[PDB]
Amino acid sequence: SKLGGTPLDIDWYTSWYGLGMKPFEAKVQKDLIEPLDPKDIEIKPDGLIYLPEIKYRRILNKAFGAGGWGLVPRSQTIVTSKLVTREYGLICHGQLISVARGEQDYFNEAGIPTATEGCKSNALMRCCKDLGVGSELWDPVFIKKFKVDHCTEKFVEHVTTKRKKKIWLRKDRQVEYPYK
Amino acid sequence: SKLGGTPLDIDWYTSWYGLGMKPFEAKVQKDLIEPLDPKDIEIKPDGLIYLPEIKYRRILNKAFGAGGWGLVPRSQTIVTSKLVTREYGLICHGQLISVARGEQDYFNEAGIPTATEGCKSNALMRCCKDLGVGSELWDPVFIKKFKVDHCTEKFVEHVTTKRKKKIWLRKDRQVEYPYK
Amino acid sequence: SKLGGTPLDIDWYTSWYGLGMKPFEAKVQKDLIEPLDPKDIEIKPDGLIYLPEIKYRRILNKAFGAGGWGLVPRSQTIVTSKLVTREYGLICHGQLISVARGEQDYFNEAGIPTATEGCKSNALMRCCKDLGVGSELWDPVFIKKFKVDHCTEKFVEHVTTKRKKKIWLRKDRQVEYPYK
Amino acid sequence: SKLGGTPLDIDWYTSWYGLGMKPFEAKVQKDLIEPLDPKDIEIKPDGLIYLPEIKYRRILNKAFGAGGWGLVPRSQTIVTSKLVTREYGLICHGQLISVARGEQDYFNEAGIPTATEGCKSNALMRCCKDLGVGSELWDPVFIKKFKVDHCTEKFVEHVTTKRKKKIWLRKDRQVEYPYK
Amino acid sequence: SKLGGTPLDIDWYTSWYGLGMKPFEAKVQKDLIEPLDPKDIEIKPDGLIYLPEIKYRRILNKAFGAGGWGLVPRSQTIVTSKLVTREYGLICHGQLISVARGEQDYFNEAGIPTATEGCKSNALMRCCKDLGVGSELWDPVFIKKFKVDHCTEKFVEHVTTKRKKKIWLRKDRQVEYPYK
Amino acid sequence: SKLGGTPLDIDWYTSWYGLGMKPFEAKVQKDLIEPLDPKDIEIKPDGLIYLPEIKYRRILNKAFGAGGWGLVPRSQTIVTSKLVTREYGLICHGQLISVARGEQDYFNEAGIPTATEGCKSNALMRCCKDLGVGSELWDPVFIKKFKVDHCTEKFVEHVTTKRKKKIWLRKDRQVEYPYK
């Protein structure tokens, strides 16, 4: 109760069946460790590289196939005063892999469900860390080299309050909202 | 209770049966990842591309067939003061795929049921994200290229209050209500 | 309770049996996706095309047969101060397909039951959206082309208060009540 | 209750099945004791060398394979006023290896879930100590030699409060936040 | 309750299965009694020689193999006002060897979990005393000879309070925190 | 309750299986009665000769082998106000030999677990008395002769309170804490 909020065949809500039971067969493993395409990697303005959730979903569809994987809630959705959090589990081929808790920051009381799926996506991607999907994203050497050959530091002009700020962006990507 | 509102064989309301149990057979998977037709993609005035719900329904009918798929409510309909939200699950071939929560903004107290189906549609489309339906819609590179070869920025005249505003539209699509 | 109103073998009221269990056989699917006849499509004066409920009923009778389909109430009839709403489910071949909520606007306290069947019809048609019945009705490209080759904008004279108004109508259809 | 906080097939939550039952076959053992790459070893500013969690995950994926290993919670997440702690167990090939408790320091009330996965990572790495993953990291002779041939002591200028401080860094690595 | 604190296939928590049932085969016994490397032996400042826990873990991995051994809790973690204690059991090849209680002194209320693994390590090493791992460490003749040919008594200057103190250290090892 | 304290396949906690059932085979018996090395025998300052517990453990490992013997608790740990006591049983080759109660004097409330293993060691050695391990230690003629050819009485100066005391020590062993 440290976080200030209130809830908004196999019982997958609480079951731990198949957790690290047996490894997948060869082509699955080959598709999981497939190197990321550097062209598809995005970077937040604050300077953290990431991968869109649709890329994670496409990788999962290419590896396990549609219907061969899914997400299950594991705990009630706790809505903090400034974020929405929930704990999710990833199931592939009737087998539990990992359970991780996601986050999504919301600034408007109306946009809380818009966050409740954002958090879900975050949970998904973080669970995918167990499978090694986008491992290069968390490699510090990969981050440094990708940050020096594909990302540039540009001094942008914030238009909402007419204040200057220096932010990170891709070489081929322009500046978007809320910035210039 | 953070959101301010009040409720308006297999027990699919709460069951998790088949969630990521087995993948679908080959032609189903081939139809799910079929590339989108660029002619059918629409764009909201605010600058977000999307796909009509009827296209999602047609894709589902082409993939699983009529009667082979459906939506089930998973939680009571919570009606916020400015939107209607509900949590829905997608079931195909007696198998649960995903459960996601939708939104629909309503501006009139009478048009609340008109929202309760809008939210349903939204839930459907968001659940379809697990199957990869319209994955290109969430690809930032696809969004940029489609936004530069098929969408144009036009300075329109709002007629309700006689104020100028610059909005996004398709090249072959005119301006509709509430705008010019 | 956001809406202001008060209630006016298989327990189909609450059961979810057969929801997306198995698809229908070939001729059923062929009849469901049969293209609409453009001659039968009507348009409301406000500019929204639709299909009479009798056409939906005829399509259902041609596809599943008489007695092979029906509607079941799913919730108590809530009567708002300006509309009547109820939630209905569609059952074909002992199988649940979809559950959707309909609307019917009423302007007279006596004509409330006249609305309670209108809403039912609306619910039916909206549920039929899952089967793909009248999918072309929700296709924006179909709406534009049908609105330019079969519908005309005419400046009509309202006779109740002697005021001018410009409304939409079919080329072969005259003006009806409450208009000229 | 000494720590000041409150909770935020095989029942792996409490089961001890397979704990030290049988050893793994030859190639697994060969991959577990594979020497660390000195280029991948990082060092905290305070002077403690460590290995990123993604490296541990990659080693586990190379040894047991994706889906052949996972983590299970063993106790409720206790959130101290300045850190988040939880007890985790490592399961490989349906066999329990070790159960260890992790830590993650948090300085913002919003960033508590950001800690709840950090602690998970820490738990993972500490459990990996049983398998011998990164054993050289805890070898004092390895620490001394790696600290003298690959790490340098540099006098950096803290920019938040304009105070001088001498910290540890890699030869090829620059200074990051919160420092210069 | 003399200590002032409060709790923070085979049921290995309480089972005594295999306790001294049969001896191990020849190569295991040969690896257990393998003489210690004098270069790897460390000495605390107070004058007590010891072996890092990673060395014990490496010896166990070389003898029984990864997954062939593990630790199980045997009693609830009792946290004294100045130390953390817990009782642990060592299991190798599905066989119980010994159960011993460890210690870890903690000086900060936050660093209690940092102690709960220290105690675990201590328990491990003390249990290893049954197998004869590091027997020479407890041999008084070995302690005297190693203390005279490899350890030196040096008069160091404590920097926290500027007080002199004479402490023990290795010939090739410098002085660390909290001392000079 | 005369002592003032409070508790801090085969159920070996209470079972008496194998107690004096059959003798061991020849080489075991030969190794058990092997004469002690006079160089390894130590003497307490008060004038009682003894053998370090590591020597007993080494003898047991040489006789029965690692994993062929162990200790089991037989009663709850009773902690007297000035000592820690517990009753332990020795099991070799799946056979119970003896059950004896040990002691360990403690002078600090924190060092109680440090005593709980000391007592265990004491119990072990006392149980070993049944096997004849270190029988010469309890032989009065052996004690007299070893006390006259290998031990000397020296007048030492206690440094804590600056008081004189005459204590026993080995010829080759110096004076340790708390004495000079």
Resolution, in Å, please? 3.0
| C-beta atoms surrounding D180 within 10 Å | 13
- The residues on E that touch D, with CB distances below 8 Å, are 5-13, 39-40, 42, 52-55, 57-58, 61, 64-73, 79, 91-94, 109-110, 112-114, 116-117, 120
Subunits with 3+ C-beta pairs closer than 8 A to C: B
Give the span between the Cα atoms of D17 and E11, in whole angstroms. 8
Q: How far apart are CA A150 and CA A38, in angstroms?
A: 9
Alpha helices in A18-137 (DSSP H): 26-32, 53-63, 112-131
Closest approach of chain B CAs to the CA of C92, in angstroms? 9
Q: Both tokens of residue D98?
A: 């070790």
Task: Count CB-CB contacts under 10 A for residue A81.
Answer: 11
Nearest residue, CB atoms, D112 vs list A2, A97, A102: A2
Residues 6+ apart with CB under 8 A from F17: F10, F94, F95, F96
Structure tokens at A69: 């994987």
| Unique residue bearing structure tokens 């070939």 | C26
F39 to chain E: which residues are within 8 Å by CB? 141
E101: its two tokens: 């209680």
Judge: A61–B33 Cβ closer than 8 Å, yes or no: yes
Which one, of C94, C102, C82, C73, lies nearest residue C14 by Cα? C73
Cis status, amide bond into F178, omega within 30 of 0: yes
Written as six digits, the tokens of B139 are 């690809």
Give the separation between CA E89 and CA E12, rounded to whole angstroms: 9
* CA–CA gap between residue E80 and residue E78 (Å, rounded): 6
**Interchain contact, F66 vs E20, CB within 8 Å:** no
Instruction: Compute the distance between CA of residue B70 and CA of residue A114 in angstroms, rounded to an integer.
Output: 23
Contacts of B99 in chain A (CB under 8 A): 73
Cα A86 to Cα A72: distance, rounded to the nearest angstrom: 11
Note the Cα F43 to chain centre separation in Å.
13
Q: Residue A143 carries which DSSP code?
A: H
Residues paired with residue D69 on neighbouring β-strands, in sequence order: D92
The residue with tokens 């002619």 is B39
Helix and strand numbers (H, E) in chain B are 4, 8
Where is D140: in which H helix or E strand? helix D140-149
- Distance (Å) from the C-alpha of residue A73 to the closest C-alpha of chain D? 15
Contacts of D17 in chain E (CB under 8 A): 9-10
Instruction: Please count the CA atoms within 13 angstroms of the CA of E62 that sit on its side-chain side.
Output: 14
Calculate ∠ Cα C51-C53-C56, nearest 5°. 80
Rounded CA-CA distance A177/A160 in Å is 10
Residues 6+ apart with CB under 8 A from D101: D75, D85, D86, D87, D88, D123, D126, E113, E116, E117
> Which has the closest alpha carbon to C46: C159, C151, C148, C172?
C151
- Residue B91 tokens, joined: 């079931």
Q: Are the C-beta atoms of E134 and E127 separated by less than 8 Å?
A: no
Q: Are F50 and F137 in contact (CB under 8 A)?
A: yes
Q: Give the nearest partner residue to A97 out of D10, D54, D67, using CB atoms.
A: D67
* The pair of three-digit structure tokens given for residue E90, joined into one six-digit string: 């060592």
In single-letter form, the type of residue at position D132 comes to G
C36 near C58, Cβ under 8 Å? no
Which is it for the CA torsion F78, F79, F85, F88, positive or negative? positive
Q: How far is CA A96 from CA A100, B24, D102, E95, in A?
A: 12, 19, 22, 29
Which residue blocks in C48-149 are alpha helix, DSSP H? 53-63, 112-131, 140-149
Chain A residues with CB under 8 Å of D120 CB are 100
CB contact under 8 A, F67 and E20: yes
Q: What is the C-alpha separation between A79 and B1, in angstroms, rounded?
A: 9
Q: Do D19 and E72 touch (CB under 8 A)?
A: yes
Measured between CA atoms, how close is E158 to chain F, in angstroms?
23
Long-range CB contacts (< 8 A, 24+ apart) of B4-7?
Answer: B4/A109, B4/B80, B4/B81, B5/B78, B5/B79, B5/B80, B5/B81, B5/B85, B5/C2, B6/B78, B6/B79, B6/C1, B6/C2, B7/B76, B7/B77, B7/B78, B7/C1
CA dihedral E98, E99, E103, E108 (to 10 degrees): 130
Cβ-Cβ contacts under 8 Å, C93 against chain B: 67
Bridge partner list, D167: D154
Run of H or E including C165: strand C163-170
* Optimal mutation site among E6, E13, E58, E173, interface D, most CBs of chain D within 10 A: E58
Residues 6 or more apart whose CB falls under 8 angstroms from that of D4 comprise: D80, D81, E109
**Cβ-based contacts of E131 with chain F (< 8 Å):** 61, 66-67
Structure tokens at E100: 């011993």
Antiparallel, parallel or unpaired: β D151-158 and D163-170: antiparallel
Strand, helix or coil at C72?
strand
d(CA C146, CA A39): 43
User: Do F46 and E74 form a contact (C-beta atoms < 8 A)?
Assistant: no
Partners of F45 in beta bridges? none
Listed residue (B131, B132, B85) closest to B106, CA to CA: B85
Quote the CA–CA distance of C106 and C101 in Å, as a whole number.
Answer: 16
* CA C164 vs CA C153, C158, C167, C173, D33: distances in Å: 13, 6, 10, 19, 88
Among B12, B79, B108, the strongest candidate for a mutation testing the C interface, having the largest count of C CBs within 10 A, is B12
Cα–Cα distance measured from residue B94 to residue B17, given in angstroms and rounded to the nearest whole number = 8
Report the half-sphere exposure of A148 (CA within 13 A, side-chain side): 6
> How many angstroms separate the CA atoms of F142 and F159, rounded?
33
Is D143 within 8 Å of D124 (Cβ atoms)? no
CA distance E122 to E105: 11
For residue C170, what are its two tokens? Answer: 């079919």
CA distance C83 to chain B (A): 7
* Technique used by the depositors: cryo-EM
Please tell me the distance from the alpha carbon of residue E172 to that of residue B2, in angstroms, as a whole number: 63
> d(Cα E116, Cα E98) in Å, to the nearest integer?
20
Q: Is the peptide bond before E7 cis (omega within 30 degrees of 0)?
A: no
Query: Which tokens go with D60?
Result: 């586990």
Alpha carbon of A6 to those of A1, A84, B74, C113, F54: distances in Å?
A: 9, 10, 19, 42, 58
> Residue A101: which of D120, E180, B3 has the closest Cα?
D120
SS3 E139: coil
Helices F53-63 & E112-131, crossing angle to 10 degrees? 50
Residue located via tokens 């009665």 = F33
Contacts of D64 in chain A (CB under 8 A): 20, 23
Strands (E), chain E: 42-43, 49-50, 69-73, 78-79, 83-92, 95-105, 151-158, 163-170
Specify the DSSP class assigned to residue F34. Answer: P
Neighboring chain C residues of B70 at a CB cutoff of 8 Å: 19-20, 96-98, 130
**In this structure, which amino acid lies at residue C45?**
P
Strand spans (E) along D56-162: 69-73, 78-79, 83-92, 95-105, 151-158
Q: Which of B6, B9, B176 to mutate to test the interface with C (most CBs of C within 10 A)?
A: B9
- Residues of chain C in Cβ contact (below 8 Å) with chain B: 1-4, 16-24, 28-29, 32-33, 78, 80, 82-83, 85, 92-93, 95-103, 105, 126, 129-132, 135, 138-141
Whether residue D140 has a cis bond before it, omega within 30° of 0: no
User: How many CA atoms are closer than 13 Å to the CA of B73, on its beta-carbon side?
Assistant: 19
Rounding to the nearest 10 degrees, give the CA dihedral for residues F17, F19, F21, F23. 130
State the virtual CA torsion across A173, A179, B3, B5 in degrees, nearest 10.
-100
Residue type, D129: K
Instruction: Quote the CA–CA distance of D71 and D87 in Å, as a whole number.
Output: 10
Contact E102, E126 (CB under 8 A): yes
What are the strands, taking DSSP E only, across chain F?
A: 42-43, 49-50, 69-73, 78-79, 83-92, 95-105, 151-158, 163-170
**Is C49 strand, coil or helix?**
strand
3-class DSSP state for residue C65? coil
Task: Give start and end residues of each alpha helix (H) in B19-162.
Answer: 26-32, 53-63, 112-131, 140-149
Q: Which residues pair with A108 in a beta bridge?
A: none
Partner residue facing D80 (CB), from E57, E65, E110: E110
Neighbours of A151 (CB within 10 A): 19
| Residue that has been written with the tokens 């300045």 in this structure | D82
- Rounded CA-CA distance F5/F78 in Å is 6
User: Which of A21, A24, A29 has its CB closest to that of D94?
Assistant: A21
Question: Could you tell me if C27 and B100 are in contact, meaning their C-beta atoms sit under 8 angstroms apart?
Answer: no
Among E19, E23, E138, the residue with its CB nearest the CB of F91 is E19
Give the contacts of D79 (CB within 8 A, at least 6 positions apart): A2, A3, D5, D6, D8, D85, D112
Taking the C-alpha atoms of residue C176 and residue F60, their distance in angstroms, rounded to an integer, is 108
- Phi/psi of residue A91, each to 5°? -120, 125
> Phi and psi (nearest 5°) for A16?
-115, 25
Strand partners, D50: D42
For chain F, list residues whose CB is within 8 angstroms of any CB belonging to chain E.
Answer: 5-13, 39-40, 42, 52-55, 57-58, 61, 64-73, 79, 91-94, 109-110, 112-114, 116-117, 120
3-class secondary structure, A63: helix
Q: Is D49 helix (H, G, I), strand (E, B) or coil?
A: strand
Sequence-distant (6+) residues with CB within 8 A of F117 are E100, E101, E126, F104
Please give the structure tokens belonging to residue A161.
């309050």
Collapsing DSSP states into helix, strand and coil, what is residue E146? helix
Using alpha carbons, list the distances in angstroms from residue F104 to C79, D177, F5, F90, F119: 83, 53, 14, 18, 5
The type of residue at F87 is E
Residues 6+ apart with CB under 8 A from F25: none
Residue B87's alpha-carbon distances to B116, E144, E165, F143, in angstroms, are 11, 73, 69, 85
Dihedral sign for Cα A11, A12, A15, A17, please: positive
Close Cβ partners of B126 (under 8 Å, ≥ 6 residues apart):
A117, B100, B101, B102
- Angle F36-F42-F44 from CA coordinates, rounded to 5°: 140
End-to-end CA distance of chain D: 40
Tell me if B20 and A112 make a contact (CB, 8 A cut-off): no
Is E10 within 8 Å of D16 (Cβ atoms)? yes
Which residues are CB-neighbours of E85 under 8 A, at least 6 positions away? E3, E5, E77, E78, E79, E101, E102, E103, E104, E119, F113
Chains C and D touch (3+ CB pairs under 8 A): no
Nearest CA in chain D to E97: D20
Report the C-alpha gap between D162 and A166 in whole angstroms: 21
- Residue reference for tokens 């327990």: C11
E156-166 burial: b if 16+ Cβ within 10 Å, else e: eeeeeeeeeee
**Which residues in chain B have Cβ-Cβ distances shorter than 8 Å to C49?**
none
Query: In Å, how far from its chain's centre is CA D41?
Result: 13
